[PDB]
Every structure is written in C-alpha cells, then in structure tokens.
Amino acid sequence: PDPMKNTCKLLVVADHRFYRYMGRGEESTTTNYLIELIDRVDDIYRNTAWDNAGFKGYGIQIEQIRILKSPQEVKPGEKHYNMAKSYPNEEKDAWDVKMLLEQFSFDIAEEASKVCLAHLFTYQDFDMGTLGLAYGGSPHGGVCPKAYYSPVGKKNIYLNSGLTSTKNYGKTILTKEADLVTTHELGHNFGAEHDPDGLAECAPNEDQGGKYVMYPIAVSGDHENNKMFSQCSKQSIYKTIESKAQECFQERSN
Numbered sequence: 001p002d003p004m005k006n007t008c009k010l011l012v013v014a015d016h017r018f019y020r021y022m023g024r025g026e027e028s029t030t031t032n033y034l035i036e037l038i039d040r041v042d043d044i045y046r047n048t049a050w051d052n053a054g055f056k057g058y059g060i061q062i063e064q065i066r067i068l069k070s071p072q073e074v075k076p077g078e079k080h081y082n083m084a085k086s087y088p089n090e091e092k093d094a095w096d097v098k099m100l101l102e103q104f105s106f107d108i109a110e111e112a113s114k115v116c117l118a119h120l121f122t123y124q125d126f127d128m129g130t131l132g133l134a135y136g137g138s139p140h141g142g143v144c145p146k147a148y149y150s151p152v153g154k155k156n157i158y159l160n161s162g163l164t165s166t167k168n169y170g171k172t173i174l175t176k177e178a179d180l181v182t183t184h185e186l187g188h189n190f191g192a193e194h195d196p197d198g199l200a201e202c203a204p205n206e207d208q209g210g211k212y213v214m215y216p217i218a219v220s221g222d223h224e225n226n227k228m229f230s231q232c233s234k235q236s237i238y239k240t241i242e243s244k245a246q247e248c249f250q251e252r253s254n
C-alpha cells in the first residue's frame with residue numbers, strides 16, 4: 001500500500017433533522033457524534049486485511065463536516081435534500097430513500113467533485129426499516145468522484161455518495177447500530193455488494209459468528225462477525241481499492 005494514498009477523505013453532512021434530533025441543536029454535540037462514529041468505522045476499515053496478507057491500513061477520515069442548522073428554504077416545485085418536507089410524500093416522516101440519495105448527490109455535486117466520498121447523515125424514519133443507501137457494488141459509483149450527466153438535473157452529478165439515518169421505527173437507533181449502517185453503506189462505496197446466502201463462508205449461521213456487515217438484513221452487532229467484512233466483501237473491495245487508491249486516496253492525517 002502507498003501510505004501517501006491510503007485514506008479516503010470524506011465530506012460529512014448533517015442536515016437540520018440530524019442537527020435537531022441527534023445534535024440537540026448544538027454544533028459541538030453534532031460534530032462530536034460524527035467524528036467519533038467515523039473513527040470507529042475507520043477502525044474497522046484500517047484493520048481489515050483486504051488480501052488477508054499485508055494489504056491493510058486503508059480507511060477513512062473526515063475532511064469537512066457541514067452542518068445545516070435549519071431546513072433549506074425552497075421555491076414552490078423546487079426540492080432540496082435539506083428542505084423541511086419529505087419527498088415525494090410530504091405526509092410521511094421521511095423521503096423515499098432512493099430519491100433522497102439522488103437529490104443529495106445533485107445538491108452537493110460541486111463539493112463532491114473535490115472529495116473521495118460524501119456522506120449524508122439524517123434523522124428520518126425510512127419505510128420498512130431501511131437505514132441507509134449508497135452507490136457502488138450494485139446490480140456505477142463509489143469512492144472517487146465519477147461524473148454522471150443528469151438529463152433531468154441538467155448538470156453533472158457524482159456517484160461517490162451515500163447516506164445514513166439514525167432513526168428507525170420512531171426512535172433513535174443505538175450507537176452500535178449506527179456504526180453498522182455507515183460501515184455497510186461505505187462498504188458499498190468501497191465496491192462491496194451484499195453477502196449472498198448461497199456462500200456459507202460469506203453468510204455464516206448464528207453459531208458460526210453470525211452474518212457479516214454487508215449482509216442485506218440489518219444485524220444488531222451482537223454477533224461476532226457483524227462488525228467485520230466477509231471474504232466476499234474483501235475480494236470486491238480489494239479489487240476496487242487498487243484501481244482507486246492512486247486516483248483519489250490521500251495520506252492519513254496524523
């Protein structure tokens with residue numbers, strides 16, 4: 001690994017929802033939560049041997065934390081990821097998660113072109129227990145800004161983004177749970193797809209340590225494998241990490 005290029009710098013954004021409900025309406029409380037979360041998530045990444053050998057030391061660090069203290073005032077018909085109402089159903093507490101990710105990508109496109117990854121932290125109750133979403137490892141996107149011209153948006157947007165909500169079923173999720181969501185979404189950004197039941201090695205039984213972080217069904221984090229990447233995820237991220245490090249990875253600060 002190139003110690004000069006082993007860290008994916010992040011642009012972390014907290015919308016007014018997160019600021020109010022998670023940060024208690026205080027910058028200090030909001031940034032502290034995020035700084036500590038990314039650090040724990042980083043511990044997972046830095047310590048992972050993508051090649052089960054010496055290809056490790058790769059992780060994430062926050063470059064900028066943007067805090068949107070109040071909803072984004074918009075003109076009728078116009079939408080923004082930080083606006084007060086949910087879209088498309090203003091009656092629901094949350095946006096359709098997919099449309100929200102696209103909107104976030106559209107709105108922070110300018111800032112996203114200057115970073116390895118952009119991650120939105122919000123506080124809205126997504127339907128059917130969904131906690132987050134991200135580009136990369138699908139059916140393109142992920143680490144390092146890749147342009148995509150949006151016909152509807154009339155500009156280039158970048159697919160190096162993801163989001164995490166710390167609210168599910170009417171309550172704030174446990175910090176141990178939030179860590180898992182971000183690790184999983186960032187996992188997608190790093191190229192990992194979900195672990196398939198078809199490969200036991202990548203989706204063990206509860207008596208074998210449980211499932212790994214990229215399993216599609218949320219894992220409380222009370223089982224051993226829960227906060228680790230399976231061999232399937234490792235292989236994917238390993239392939240991705242190589243062709244990408246030189247492109248946008250930087251040197252770890254500290």
Ligand SMILES: CC(C)C[C@H](CC(=O)NO)C(=O)N[C@H](C(=O)N[C@@H](C)C(=O)NCCN)C(C)(C)C
Nearest residue numbers: 128129130131132133134181184215216217218
């Ligand atoms: C951290 C997890 C892995 C993220 C995924 C979504 C995903 O794959 N993001 O990239 C999720 O929220 N999964 C939900 C989940 O497991 N949520 C749990 C809390 C749930 O609703 N469990 C009860 C089922 N009614 C689904 C969509 C499966 C309901």
Ligand SMILES: [Zn+2]
Nearest residue numbers: 184188194216
């Ligand atoms: Zn997923």
